[PDB]
Design a protein around this ligand. Structure first.
Ligand SMILES: *[C@@H]1O[C@H](CO)[C@@H](O[C@@H]2O[C@H](CO)[C@@H](O[C@@H]3O[C@H](CO)[C@@H](O)[C@H](O[C@H]4O[C@H](CO)[C@@H](O)[C@H](O)[C@@H]4O)[C@@H]3O)[C@H](O)[C@H]2NC(C)=O)[C@H](O)[C@H]1NC(C)=O
Ligand SMILES: *[C@@H]1O[C@H](CO)[C@@H](O[C@@H]2O[C@H](CO)[C@@H](O[C@@H]3O[C@H](CO)[C@@H](O)[C@H](O[C@H]4O[C@H](CO)[C@@H](O)[C@H](O)[C@@H]4O)[C@@H]3O)[C@H](O)[C@H]2NC(C)=O)[C@H](O)[C@H]1NC(C)=O
Ligand SMILES: CC(=O)N[C@H]1[C@H](O[C@@H]2[C@@H](O)[C@H](O)O[C@H](CO)[C@@H]2O)O[C@H](CO)[C@@H](O[C@@H]2O[C@H](CO)[C@H](O)[C@H](O)[C@H]2O)[C@@H]1O
Ligand SMILES: CC(=O)N[C@H]1[C@H](O[C@@H]2[C@@H](O)[C@H](O)O[C@H](CO)[C@@H]2O)O[C@H](CO)[C@@H](O[C@@H]2O[C@H](CO)[C@H](O)[C@H](O)[C@H]2O)[C@@H]1O
Ligand code: UDP
Ligand code: UDP
Ligand code: NAG
Ligand code: NAG
Ligand code: NAG
Ligand code: MG
Ligand code: MG
Lengths: 313, 325
């Protein structure tokens, strides 16, 4: 009865246009109960659900010219200049130690004037030319379009970085202990590494029905429970799985919560992401508190540099 | 009954006028004369050790900013990383203009954000921004909360040196919405007498220092004793350029204070003046229920606090607000 569930079931029957239909899908105004009274973000989500063929405005095509051991992929918005630079100087440094290459990309969409964003296009061009780590696509960068940010990033992995051994995807305000991540990745068996997917995995979750939370999903949009999913603050997976995940995205309708969407894709593949206790996407309760952690949400740019500096000793 | 350290040093200054300005070595005396110095937070140690130093130089100047005599100079406190805040101001209420040959010009007021304070290095982008927009003033001191009174004194020096003929000054924060049209209408309503010593804002009377160690405005009893003079909250206040010159001259006679808007109130009190409350300055915001009605902003001078998109949104709706409301 909920809209997403019914359309997804239609998709299941077709695989057992929803991909490049980019006119407004006016059907939703008649088939979604109370559509006129939905918040604008749901109107936009429903009207443009069947469009995901957006193009790269800023690419870094040689980012993976040397096959990486680890790709860091960080969700960011144009105005977050200090967040990105703190990451570059702390846990997101690119490196080649042990010939285990780490490369870094930030994942951006457009911040257009119609959404009341200041025009930062000249600063973003300066930054992209200076640091060569900005990927930017021509879609409206919004909270409910983070699942678009996920799908287009996975597409970019498939086209431009398909041979990375591992992928870390996360937020631009989480602290990551990249040394611990690399140590963990190097201790993996070959079998465990082929389909690795770990994070702060949430089981038996359901959609928030509370209208004051940013995660609110109306009953007319989605019914039932969520699959197991790793919290989007940051998760870690094999590049092999990144390609299998990209292939399966066509068979899963976009969903307004992006980390739930990745969990939906894993489930369709027959996989279950595994919890690693070092991923603290809901923060901690002292620099020694951070020694054994993989990730902590959330930290400001100065805090990111401070923690990283103290951890090096 | 010995006063607190700031009061005692201010008493010494008062008697000297009825070095504290370019002594930039650490004043190790404070470790002996400030009660409990060793147990103070680092920000108080730094403030006390370097209290007598304020001859910092401009690294980035805009020397022709006031080549055309302004009617109103907008001076906005900002920090290096705040690119989106500054651009939103440029496009909304901080636009430069010449309507009615009443020139409005804009500067942002910055210090350094050094790597030793764990700041990411954004210096090349700031230099690019300055080259593009020609509205960055930057001095070579450590930009911190407790150095904002330094930001105030160095800005007033720049007005005396480089913009002394501006008719009015608005000084405010980079996270406030300002109804600049209402400000200009108000300034054009003033008698010549009221305008000569104009100083208005969200004026707080009978305030004292916060003694709760958990608040960012905390001030220890060993640092400052007694009450605060009347003062306009720093989110933004409005005053004459004539008074800006009088305020600059008097800064030499008032020791820096960790809270910048209290410092400005101290300087006004030394001038024999009392800032006046204007109800349109909402430095503690407006009612939660009226935040999404643009008519709520028509009669306001200033609202704290708003994000870059919110400032642009409010400004855009305000340009057609005369059609409703
Ligand atoms: C995720 O990103 C996608 C891609 O950027 C984004 O899709 C875009 O949404 C906007 C609406 O938010 C669409 O813009 C509309 O296009 C139609 C074309 O006919 C216009 O008629 C619409 O007019 C509206 O706005 C007018 C004023 O400008 C009003 O007068 C009028 O009444 C309408 O309200 C409107 O401009 C745009 O076409 C798509 N672009 C695509 C599909 O490529 C989507 O919104 C984002 N999703 C979320 C959840 O944020
Ligand atoms: C307001 O701005 C002023 C001007 O920027 C700023 O003054 C500066 O303060 C810093 C301290 O925070 C001073 O730097 C110190 O200088 C002394 C020598 O005079 C050094 O011994 C200090 O070394 C420290 O760090 C070393 C390495 O970690 C340690 O080994 C050592 O023990 C110290 O911890 C440090 O370099 C600087 O000299 C002044 N500059 C000037 C021009 O006065 C002031 O701090 C700001 N005030 C506030 C309240 O923020
Ligand atoms: C089972 C679970 O953990 N579900 C969500 C969790 O609900 C909490 C309840 O289990 C608990 O009893 O009460 C608290 C109230 O204090 C919570 O309601 O809440 C978290 C935080 O919202 C959810 O994780 C988040 O889910 C959203 C999507 O709704 C999104 O995926 C986000 O990234 C993730 O952090 C749990 O799913
Ligand atoms: C007289 C006054 O307003 N004093 C400060 C005010 O104190 C409030 C108390 O009067 C009341 O009993 O409790 C409330 C808390 O619910 C307040 O504590 O608090 C405001 C907010 O801090 C102060 O304004 C701020 O002062 C700091 C310096 O201390 C700084 O100048 C800042 O710009 C300003 O907004 C009142 O001074
Ligand atoms: O339109 C958006 C909104 C958010 N983000 C990024 O998504 C991540 C999560 O945002 P937020 O902190 O608001 O979400 P929460 O952690 O509260 O779920 C952050 O890295 C944001 O920079 C984004 O890229 N585009
Ligand atoms: O080290 C600093 C800290 C703050 N600010 C500016 O001072 C103003 C007030 O900052 P904040 O909002 O944190 O203070 P609050 O309103 O909470 O008293 C804003 O314009 C900041 O950009 C600054 O210039 N340097
Ligand atoms: C997606 O593809 C269709 C044609 O197949 C095209 O009309 C549409 O403009 C494309 N969408 C975008 C955003 O380019
Ligand atoms: C201020 O002046 C004194 C000498 O006049 C000098 O030693 C000191 O370094 C100056 N301070 C700064 C920050 O230039
Ligand atoms: C316009 O303003 C300037 C000061 O900014 C003044 O010198 C000039 O005389 C004015 N011109 C007119 C037309 O009054
Ligand atoms: Mg977050
Ligand atoms: Mg503020």
């Amino acid at each position: 009865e909920a809209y997403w569930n019914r359309e997804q079931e239609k998709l299941n029957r077709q695989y057992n246009s929803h991909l490049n239909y980019c006119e407004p899908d006016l059907r939703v105004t008649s088939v979604v109960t109370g559509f006129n009274n939905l918040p604008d973000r749901f109107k936009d989500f429903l009207l443009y659900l069947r469009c995901r063929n957006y193009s790269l405005l800023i690419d870094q095509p040689d980012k993976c010219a040397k096959k990486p051991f680890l790709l860091l992929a960080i969700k960011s918005l144009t105005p977050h200049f200090a967040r990105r630079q703190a990451i570059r100087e702390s846990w997101g440094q690119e490196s080649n130690a042990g010939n285990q290459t780490v490369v870094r990309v930030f994942l951006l969409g457009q911040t257009p004037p119609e959404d009341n964003h200041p025009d930062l296009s000249d600063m973003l061009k300066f930054e992209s030319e200076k640091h060569q780590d900005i990927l930017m696509w021509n879609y409206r960068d919004t909270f409910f379009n983070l699942s678009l940010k996920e799908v287009l990033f996975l597409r970019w992995v498939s086209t431009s970085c398909p041979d990375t051994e591992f992928v870390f995807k996360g937020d631009d305000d989480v602290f990551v202990n990249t040394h611990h991540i690399l140590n963990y990745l190097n201790s993996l068996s070959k079998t465990k590494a082929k389909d690795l997917f770990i994070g702060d995995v949430i089981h038996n979750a359901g959609p928030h029905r509370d209208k004051k939370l940013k995660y609110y999903i109306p009953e007319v949009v989605y019914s039932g429970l969520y699959p197991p999913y790793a919290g989007g603050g940051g998760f870690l997976y094999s590049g092999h799985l990144a390609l299998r995940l990209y292939h399966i995205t066509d068979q899963v309708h976009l969903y307004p919560i992006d980390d739930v969407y990745t969990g939906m894709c894993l489930q369709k593949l027959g996989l279950v992401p595994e919890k690693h206790k070092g991923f603290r996407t809901f923060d901690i309760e002292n620099i020694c508190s951070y020694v054994d952690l993989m990730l902590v949400h959330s930290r400001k740019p100065q805090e990111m540099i401070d923690i990283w500096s103290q951890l090096q000793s």
